[PDB]
Design a protein around this ligand. Structure first.
Ligand SMILES: *[C@@H]1O[C@H](CO)[C@@H](O[C@@H]2O[C@H](CO)[C@@H](O[C@@H]3O[C@H](CO[C@H]4O[C@H](CO)[C@@H](O)[C@H](O)[C@@H]4O)[C@@H](O)[C@H](O[C@H]4O[C@H](CO)[C@@H](O)[C@H](O)[C@@H]4O)[C@@H]3O)[C@H](O)[C@H]2NC(C)=O)[C@H](O)[C@H]1NC(C)=O
Ligand SMILES: *[C@@H]1O[C@H](CO)[C@@H](O[C@@H]2O[C@H](CO)[C@@H](O[C@@H]3O[C@H](CO[C@H]4O[C@H](CO)[C@@H](O)[C@H](O)[C@@H]4O)[C@@H](O)[C@H](O)[C@@H]3O)[C@H](O)[C@H]2NC(C)=O)[C@H](O)[C@H]1NC(C)=O
Ligand SMILES: *[C@@H]1O[C@H](CO)[C@@H](O[C@@H]2O[C@H](CO)[C@@H](O[C@@H]3O[C@H](CO[C@H]4O[C@H](CO)[C@@H](O)[C@H](O)[C@@H]4O)[C@@H](O)[C@H](O)[C@@H]3O)[C@H](O)[C@H]2NC(C)=O)[C@H](O)[C@H]1NC(C)=O
Ligand SMILES: *[C@@H]1O[C@H](CO)[C@@H](O[C@@H]2O[C@H](CO)[C@@H](O[C@@H]3O[C@H](CO[C@H]4O[C@H](CO)[C@@H](O)[C@H](O)[C@@H]4O)[C@@H](O)[C@H](O)[C@@H]3O)[C@H](O)[C@H]2NC(C)=O)[C@H](O)[C@H]1NC(C)=O
Ligand SMILES: *[C@@H]1O[C@H](CO)[C@@H](O[C@@H]2O[C@H](CO)[C@@H](O[C@@H]3O[C@H](CO)[C@@H](O)[C@H](O)[C@@H]3O)[C@H](O)[C@H]2NC(C)=O)[C@H](O)[C@H]1NC(C)=O
Ligand SMILES: *[C@@H]1O[C@H](CO)[C@@H](O[C@@H]2O[C@H](CO)[C@@H](O[C@@H]3O[C@H](CO)[C@@H](O)[C@H](O)[C@@H]3O)[C@H](O)[C@H]2NC(C)=O)[C@H](O)[C@H]1NC(C)=O
Ligand SMILES: *[C@@H]1O[C@H](CO)[C@@H](O[C@@H]2O[C@H](CO)[C@@H](O[C@@H]3O[C@H](CO)[C@@H](O)[C@H](O)[C@@H]3O)[C@H](O)[C@H]2NC(C)=O)[C@H](O)[C@H]1NC(C)=O
Ligand SMILES: *[C@@H]1O[C@H](CO)[C@@H](O[C@@H]2O[C@H](CO)[C@@H](O)[C@H](O)[C@H]2NC(C)=O)[C@H](O)[C@H]1NC(C)=O
Ligand SMILES: *[C@@H]1O[C@H](CO)[C@@H](O[C@@H]2O[C@H](CO)[C@@H](O)[C@H](O)[C@H]2NC(C)=O)[C@H](O)[C@H]1NC(C)=O
Ligand SMILES: *[C@@H]1O[C@H](CO)[C@@H](O)[C@H](O)[C@H]1NC(C)=O
Ligand SMILES: *[C@@H]1O[C@H](CO)[C@@H](O)[C@H](O)[C@H]1NC(C)=O
Ligand SMILES: *[C@@H]1O[C@H](CO)[C@@H](O)[C@H](O)[C@H]1NC(C)=O
Ligand SMILES: *[C@@H]1O[C@H](CO)[C@@H](O)[C@H](O)[C@H]1NC(C)=O
Ligand SMILES: *[C@@H]1O[C@H](CO)[C@@H](O)[C@H](O)[C@H]1NC(C)=O
Ligand SMILES: *[C@@H]1O[C@H](CO)[C@@H](O)[C@H](O)[C@H]1NC(C)=O
Ligand SMILES: *[C@@H]1O[C@H](CO)[C@@H](O)[C@H](O)[C@H]1NC(C)=O
Ligand SMILES: *[C@@H]1O[C@H](CO)[C@@H](O)[C@H](O)[C@H]1NC(C)=O
Lengths: 43, 53, 53, 53, 132, 132, 132
């Protein structure tokens, strides 16, 4: 339910991250503004 | 059976250097210039109140 | 130096020296532990069993 | 000047490591609207006129 | 080496004595006033604070025209309003601490009066000397 | 409590007054000169710098034989080369800042002359007293 | 601009001269005594140490009733036990360093004697003035 002017401003990003134990990892998701993430070059 | 260190969800410990000694040593506290330290020599002093010695 | 004919009011509980030296001890302990090894890699899953020895 | 972000943001805590907490933006409750700032048109116009003079 | 020692007038140990008797040991305490990166800074700050305290006291003494003198008479009259008493019971019966406790209320007005009297005396002396 | 306040001779607020009129408030500023791990060190350094400045000024005053005195006459003659003027227009018309601006050029030679005169006077007094 | 320079009485370069001849340059060295986060703290500590040393020396001078004076006579007699010699060979043949080396043993007793004499003189003067 994003307005017309907020198209692409917010991005839902999921990634792996180290937990309290280094050998274990957790897949977590968050939201980031478009001015905080840059694409790297399908997927 | 899997176990973890009790501190892992709180903080990371800092292992003490083995050469460092934990043995307590006598220490003295001295006031700087312009200040004085008063000692109550009364043997029946109960921690608070007047002291004549 | 004994202070003849001198009576002084003492109060152990409302003494700044106790708090001051406690803070000094805490700070000195932290400073001593600062250069030592940081034991963060130990936070790993451990396979633990009992000791029948 | 009234500056507002109307999105109902949610804070989520993630345990990076020992005592390391990362705060992330979770799912937004309700509608999503652009953050905006409002000013009085007449007051701004009169201030701009005084500045111009 | 016949049993002699030091027997030196030391610290405030004479504070319990009388006014005049304790006036003997003023200079030893005056000299003691200058006895001598997270802890060295604190001890240096303590030393500097003691230095400023002593220097401010010396400046106050100099402002009243009493620099370099442990005892210095002044032209300010002693108003009886502060504490009448009499001379005999002061210098022979009362200690310094009791006197400080009694006269702790009016110290600032005494300091101001000494300041004003010394300034007036300095100007009068300058005018008199320029007259000659 | 009838409307009274403080009415105290404060800071340099009297600098705009005349020479003699501003000479009243020298001591208050003299007292003010001692008003009182990355930021505490800087403020301590500022305090120590102020302390050294005041102590150097006191040493300079003592070297000229004027220690402990706000006003101290000296034996050095006032050469007219620096600024002739006359006494009447100085102490009643000109301010301290204007005088400092005018005489800022020859301050060091005045300091040296006062030094030499005081040293000569001290030696002459020592010889005269040893004569007696 | 005819070849002139400074020709100023500077540092201890006159120490090799005689007693009386070297007494000329006491004040220049006295002024020099105040010449002016791991290294700034150390240099600040050095400055503060110099400040305390000079201030302690000034306090010692004031305690003996000689504040503000480079040369100050005293009422303490000169016992011949320390170094008899005679006046002529002292102020015209021996240097300051040799005298300090010779008299380095009994400095503390001299300081104590000057202290006691000044205190006694101050009390006697106070009593005499109160008599008038
Ligand atoms: C950013 O992107 C992330 C993923 O990268 C999104 O997170 C996912 O969001 C979806 C949609 O809400 C979540 O799916 C829902 O999760 C809930 C839990 O489901 C449980 O049960 C099902 C089986 O019933 C299991 O498979 C599942 O693992 C859970 O145990 C429920 O709210 C939902 O179930 C309901 O709806 C479905 C719809 O068909 C029905 O079939 C079910 O019967 C039931 O009624 C649904 O499963 C998903 O779990 C999230 N994943 C994670 C990892 O969190 C974020 O939402 C997205 N953010 C934004 C702002 O878009
Ligand atoms: C602590 O307080 C004590 C009690 O006041 C002090 O004792 C006093 O000490 C002084 C000397 O320092 C004495 O003064 C001397 O006293 C007598 C005078 O005679 C009178 O006293 C004697 C003995 O008490 C008595 O026999 C006579 O009848 C008189 O009454 C003479 O020796 C001298 O002239 C001199 O004045 C005080 O008398 C004495 N007071 C007493 C004992 O009550 C003590 O000194 C104080 N301590 C300090 C460190 O100051
Ligand atoms: C800032 O500058 C002002 C202007 O110079 C200062 O005003 C001066 O204030 C002083 C006192 O502080 C006055 O001195 C008094 O003046 C008169 C002498 O009579 C003459 O002046 C009056 C009034 O101007 C005039 O009616 C007569 O005909 C004379 O010409 C007497 O009351 C006293 O004896 C005393 O000398 C100055 O006259 C006055 N100057 C003026 C008003 O031009 C002011 O004080 C300065 N501010 C500070 C803080 O120093
Ligand atoms: C380092 O030590 C040198 C050796 O002692 C010092 O030289 C001395 O300098 C002073 C002046 O500063 C001279 O005093 C003058 O001497 C003569 C007196 O006549 C006698 O000496 C001359 C020359 O030696 C000789 O011809 C006569 O017969 C006498 O024996 C007069 O000019 C003055 O009145 C005044 O007294 C010393 O004589 C001189 N001593 C010598 C050359 O042995 C030198 O000054 C020292 N350096 C410092 C920086 O102090
Ligand atoms: C977080 O870590 C997980 C677990 O390692 C990563 O998932 C892995 O992603 C790779 C790359 O896409 C997968 O390889 C591919 O998988 C399929 C099935 O074989 C196929 O497309 C390719 O042949 C290739 O092998 C891998 O299977 C997958 N592992 C698991 C257990 O799902 C993930 O990419 C990491 N990053 C994020 C942001 O989640
Ligand atoms: C800053 O100014 C803008 C523009 O005036 C404000 O947006 C406007 O806000 C009002 C009050 O919330 C909205 O009215 C409401 O809109 C909906 C749809 O009708 C409904 O909730 C209510 O019935 C009511 O009419 C209005 O639509 C909205 N937009 C415009 C273009 O006027 C904004 O609220 C101001 N911000 C602040 C912090 O004052
Ligand atoms: C920014 O927001 C503030 C409030 O946070 C706005 O001020 C408020 O403005 C409203 C009208 O929009 C005022 O209500 C009216 O006030 C008076 C009586 O107080 C009267 O005209 C009406 O009966 C009505 O109640 C409200 O009082 C006022 N609040 C304050 C604290 O001033 C402000 O207008 C907003 N600015 C912009 C540029 O939108
Ligand atoms: C998701 O958003 C992206 C941008 O993050 C959309 O891709 C284009 O983005 C540019 C600006 O970078 C816009 O001008 C285009 O209109 C966007 N669309 C296309 C088709 O090029 C993308 O379309 C969005 N949708 C999906 C499903 O990824
Ligand atoms: C870190 O882990 C320890 C060990 O599990 C937690 O201590 C327990 O916390 C639970 C919480 O339900 C209590 O019921 C237990 O009694 C606690 N055990 C002990 C021995 O105290 C601790 O709370 C965790 N810390 C954080 C911040 O989550
Ligand atoms: C998003 O929009 C759809 C379509 O109008 C609506 O059904 C849904 O409830 C909305 N979701 C939220 C969370 O408002
Ligand atoms: C501002 O005020 C002026 C008159 O001062 C008026 O002409 C103008 O229309 C107003 N608005 C703007 C946007 O300038
Ligand atoms: C001091 O005054 C009091 C009160 O009048 C008196 O009793 C006492 O004797 C006086 N002391 C003297 C005169 O030494
Ligand atoms: C000093 O003033 C306080 C109140 O500020 C009063 O209680 C006390 O009695 C005063 N002391 C004297 C000695 O007058
Ligand atoms: C000061 O000297 C000037 C210049 O000669 C003269 O005009 C003025 O009247 C003098 N001021 C006096 C004498 O007060
Ligand atoms: C001081 O010297 C400067 C040049 O160094 C000169 O311009 C100025 O006029 C001099 N001031 C006075 C008051 O002589
Ligand atoms: C100093 O005393 C010595 C030793 O008696 C003597 O030789 C010398 O001449 C004296 N100096 C004088 C009198 O100037
Ligand atoms: C000073 O005392 C030392 C021993 O402490 C002795 O060797 C030396 O000769 C003495 N000096 C004088 C000048 O008497």
């Amino acid at each position: 339910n994003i307005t017309d002017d907020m198209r692409g401003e917010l991005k839902n990003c999921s990634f792996n991250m180290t937990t309290e134990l280094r050998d274990k990892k957790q897949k977590v998701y968050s939201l980031f503004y478009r001015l905080d993430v840059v694409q790297i070059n399908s997927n | 059976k899997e176990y973890r260190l009790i501190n892992c969800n709180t903080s990371a410990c800092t292992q003490a250097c083995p050469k460092v000694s934990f043995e307590p040593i006598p220490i003295h506290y001295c006031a700087p210039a312009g200040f004085a330290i008063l000692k109550c020599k009364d043997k029946k002093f109960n921690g608070t109140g007047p002291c004549p010695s | 130096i004994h202070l003849e004919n001198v009576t002084e009011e003492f109060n152990m509980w409302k003494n700044n020296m106790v708090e001051q030296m406690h803070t000094d001890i805490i700070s000195l302990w932290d400073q001593s532990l600062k250069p030592c090894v940081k034991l963060t890699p130990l936070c790993v899953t451990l396979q633990c069993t009992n000791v029948t020895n | 000047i009234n500056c507002t972000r109307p999105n109902n943001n949610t804070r989520k805590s993630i345990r990076i490591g020992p005592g390391q907490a990362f705060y992330a933006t979770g799912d937004i409750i309700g509608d999503i609207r652009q953050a905006h700032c409002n000013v009085s048109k007449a007051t701004w116009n009169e201030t701009l006129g005084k500045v111009v003079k | 080496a016949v049993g002699i020692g030091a027997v030196f007038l030391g610290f405030l140990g004479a504070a319990g004595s009388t006014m005049g008797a304790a006036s003997m040991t003023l200079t030893v305490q005056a000299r003691n006033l200058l006895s001598g990166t997270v802890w060295g800074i604190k001890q240096l700050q303590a030393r500097v604070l003691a230095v400023e305290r002593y220097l401010r006291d010396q400046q106050l003494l100099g402002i009243w025209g009493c620099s370099g003198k442990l005892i210095c008479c002044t032209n300010v009259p002693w108003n009886s309003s502060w504490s009448n008493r009499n001379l005999s019971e002061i210098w022979d019966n009362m200690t310094w601490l009791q006197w400080d406790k009694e006269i702790s209320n009016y110290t600032q007005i005494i300091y101001g009066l000494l300041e004003e009297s010394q300034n007036q005396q300095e100007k009068n002396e300058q005018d008199l000397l320029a007259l000659d």
